[PDB]
Amino acid sequence: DAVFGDRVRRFQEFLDTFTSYRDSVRSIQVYNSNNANILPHRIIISLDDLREFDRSFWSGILVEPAYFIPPAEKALTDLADSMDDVPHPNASAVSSRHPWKLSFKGSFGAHALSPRTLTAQHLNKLVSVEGIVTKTSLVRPKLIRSVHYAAKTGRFHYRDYTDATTTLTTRIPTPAIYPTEDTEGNKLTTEYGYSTFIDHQRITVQEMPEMAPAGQLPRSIDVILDDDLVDKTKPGDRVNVVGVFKSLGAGGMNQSNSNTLIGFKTLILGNTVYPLTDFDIRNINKLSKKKDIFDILSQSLAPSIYGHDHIKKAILLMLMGGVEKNLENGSHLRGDINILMVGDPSTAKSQLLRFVLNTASLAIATTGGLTAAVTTDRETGERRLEAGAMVLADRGVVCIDEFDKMTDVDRVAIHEVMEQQTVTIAKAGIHTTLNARCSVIAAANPVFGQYDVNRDPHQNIALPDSLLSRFDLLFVVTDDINEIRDRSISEHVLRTHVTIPFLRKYVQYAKERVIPQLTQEAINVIVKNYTDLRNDDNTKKSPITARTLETLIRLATAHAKVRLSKTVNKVDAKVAANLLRFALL
């Protein structure tokens, strides 16, 4: 109608009143001409700019997408199809015919929702929804425009198609298949090389657990993506998606079909996907030069725990990590550090793990699919692997509670994770290797609840020695009662009846830039201390093996990162040797 043309010209005015939009289109046009990969025919519209140019048109997209967006799509397509002559001898007949799609940004107003908050009142509106990608459907091409040649008449022909999804407005459906005869009735010569197809995919978005109240099933919604958005996400990704929330089908309105249970199907026509200082740096490096920065950082860690200085120091060293190496033979050296905690269940283990899990930037909570060697199927039957915490925590940290409760299948898989930093997947028809360079911190408890301090965890907990030897540091804590001292810590509990934001920058910057190497200073210290430990036949937490030498190098390198020195020093080995003795006693 004439109203459709009016809004097409109105959008053309918007594309001209702010040349910052169509000049980027020209940049796309120039780039595409040079590559004779192709940049997408998509631009992002700032709703605030659209708000100040035409309030009704800006509100038109949000409130009435069916009557405003298709006029805007045509105007943008018209601008792109007319800004250049397209002198390509053959590409002008197929490639230049692809329409241009829109994207949106800026203030969404009231249309910023979640799968739970999304209701029937929000239908037929362009809304932004925040959630998680549970799964993705299979990608298939979808016919858009058909091109065919009428050989008998000696001239080509064409036909377009409409779908309930691709058409925001309720246009007449076209279920007809690619035509064989046209109005003239002659058999048509099919032109696949000049027909137009567009890929299509379906995804499911669910409300994030962070805002989910207990006692209700989770809320989910389906989003439709096409063309450039067809393969831009993977399951498990946090996503903010803007699209048209529209219904389809009928709730038994045809014939009688008057059951009270039938409802109308709804989904979102998504068109925009949002997958989810030097002053500090100079302060980070300056603070490293004071002698007590190692201890001060060791006290900001775990403010709710009194004492446990070595454990807090161990957490800092584990975050700093070591340095990996590569060899001319093709071998690689592990650099990361693992920590294990053992003793009475409720005594300060869940408290320490809570702080580390909350503080660390890439901390993953685990308890007894972490092996990442299992598949999940779509609605149509096709299946895809799901990632595991050990794999996801690459270059991160793994937080384990109830480590004693994990199964034997987990133990055999984590053997290669902690030692070779990789997972060798060997399944029926699926074989791959995934990096598992993750630091591990775990807590375990004895069966009886009360730890026998006279014996090692090999008899108090009875985990395999091969599994236990993979932890660089082990700590045993039990609430041995000193009444005046326990009063001091319990007073804060009875009261309930360096800044961390900068510290996380300190940890981030130190590991980001500092890659310490060994020095002759620590070489003698490592050999002498290792030999002395081998000479020491007295009972200890664990026997002395080459892994203890590896731990000393890893710990010394971590201390150098605390000092932010790209070379190790004798003091770093001295600290590591003392700490290992504490862990071995």
Binding site: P141, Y149, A151, H157, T189, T190, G193, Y194, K234, A387
Partner: protein, 229 residues
Amino acid sequence: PSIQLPVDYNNLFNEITDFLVTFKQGPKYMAMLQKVANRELNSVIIDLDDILQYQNEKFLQGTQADDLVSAIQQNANHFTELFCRAIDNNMPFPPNLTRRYFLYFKPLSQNCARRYRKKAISSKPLSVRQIKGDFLGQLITVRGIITRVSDVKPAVEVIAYTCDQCGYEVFQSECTSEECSQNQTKGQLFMSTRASKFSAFQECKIQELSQQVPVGHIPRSLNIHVNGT
């Protein structure tokens, strides 16, 4: 609705017939058709490098030339029949219902394309994941590993019937021949299986190798159908 495209099948078909007649090994394909005419061979393999060689030969001679290879590249579905149509009239009931021979095209070689200063995108060893919807109806070369092959199954192309009332051979329950359409009585049809056109068909699937897989993804698969010889 009618539209216009720069494709002209009249020039291409004349070039195809000329290429069949002229391109030497006498002519390479005429000798091949002669062997088929001698009932020695059952299938015909068309070499796109030979077509590209002739196009460059015509290009170097300064004669008329159209990019026939790209036309076959874009619309191989129809050009398969065109080559059959050329052979059905140039080899030394409707014809298509009775043909028992088979035809295929072999891809361009990357050395040949570079030697003729052109890009053979279709013959590039791309993976199945990289095949977009733009490649529908286009002859392309796929590099991968076959993971599943089905056994031989019947694939009827034209179903044959015989009628008692007229004795005509009807191809596709009631006879549609001219005699029975005129007559008030029609002889009921039955399946003449020995006269039906059987095609040898097998189901095959190709899959990406490990090095072709992006980060953390599952290698995708594509369906390959094999027919004829």
